[PDB]
């Protein structure tokens, strides 16, 4: 075994948009979760169904790291049984979720003067996302009874919008880098453990 690539997902230069969140599969390595939980550089480190303290004592078959960027007021939606445009149309956590949600402020990294327009989000959808689903289509949403014919107009709108993170925004509109850890137990040798 060797070290787990935690610095690759937590310290990446550019994170993914919430509508197109990335996933990093971590296997065949020893992981030290205590240094992540006790670093104080994370304003939110909330685990569901597992203790963050004694998280090192457990072994799992696979660990998934989902990373993206939302705004300040939307971090509370990265929780099980939560609702909102992020949880409904962008990233849904299951009701029986087992893992940890990690979110820290990244205004000094993800906001430009005049606005950083790289981070997007979904605004409309015909039906809510199932847990861990991921929508990518840029199809013009039909909000009315008239079809759209692939053209934006009345009741037909482009379903994606940008956050436009600029530094002097209020905290509720500043960028927040979010990492969601999922632990998997399978009929297979537990490949990731603690020190």
């Amino acid at each position: 075994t060797n070290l787990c690539p935690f610095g690759e997902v937590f310290n990446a230069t550019r994170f993914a948009s919430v509508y197109a969140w990335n996933r990093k599969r971590i296997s065949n390595c020893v992981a030290d979760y205590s240094v992540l939980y006790n670093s104080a550089s994370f304003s939110t480190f909330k685990c569901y169904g597992v203790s963050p303290t004694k998280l090192n004592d457990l072994c799992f078959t696979n660990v998934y790291a989902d990373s993206f960027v939302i705004r300040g007021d939307e971090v509370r939606q990265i929780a099980p049984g939560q609702t909102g445009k992020i949880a409904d149309y962008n990233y849904k956590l299951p009701d029986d979720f087992t893992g940890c949600v990690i979110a820290w402020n990244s205004n000094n990294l993800d906001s430009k003067v005049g606005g950083n327009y790289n981070y997007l989000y979904r605004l409309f959808r015909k039906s809510n996302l199932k847990p861990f689903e991921r929508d990518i289509s840029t199809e013009i949403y039909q909000a009315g009874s008239t079809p759209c014919n692939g053209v934006e107009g009345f009741n037909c709108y482009f379903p994606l919008q940008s956050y436009g993170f600029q530094p002097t925004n209020g905290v509720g509109y500043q960028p927040y880098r979010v990492v969601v850890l999922s632990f998997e137990l399978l009929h297979a040798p537990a490949t990731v453990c603690g020190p």
Binding site: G115, E152, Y157, G164
Partner: protein, 119 residues
């Protein structure tokens, strides 16, 4: 085949009033987020106001302009308005409106100069 040009700038005095208009073309400004930025000669480009694509509270303003500015969304004319009231000679600059629909779309800008004194 998509653009937006702003108008309504010009000269005004003291606690005057001005109506900017970000006339959008080629797309419906209904569930879009418009930003208002301003640029005074030499200094940094400052964010002024913003109206969001969704939200219970869809209006956003900076601390320097809060209470005096109001950003509206005319759907019949397919344009976005910015109501600047009780002006001050400290907030005169070039005003821009930016939107994102697939890519960043810029306005050319408009000149707003408010004055003070006697004449």
């Amino acid at each position: 085949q998509v653009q937006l040009v702003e108008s309504g700038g010009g000269l005004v005095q003291a606690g005057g009033s001005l109506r900017l208009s970000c006339a959008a073309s080629g797309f419906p400004v209904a569930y879009k987020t418009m930003w208002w930025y301003r640029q005074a000669p030499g200094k940094e480009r400052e964010w002024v106001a913003a109206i969001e694509s969704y939200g219970i509270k869809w209006t956003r303003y900076a601390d320097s302009v809060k209470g005096r500015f109001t950003i509206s969304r005319d759907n019949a004319k397919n344009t976005v308005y910015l109501q600047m009231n009780s002006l001050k000679p400290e907030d005169t600059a070039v005003y821009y409106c930016i939107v994102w629909v697939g890519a960043q779309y810029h306005g050319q800008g408009t000149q707003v100069t408010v004055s003070a004194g006697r004449a």
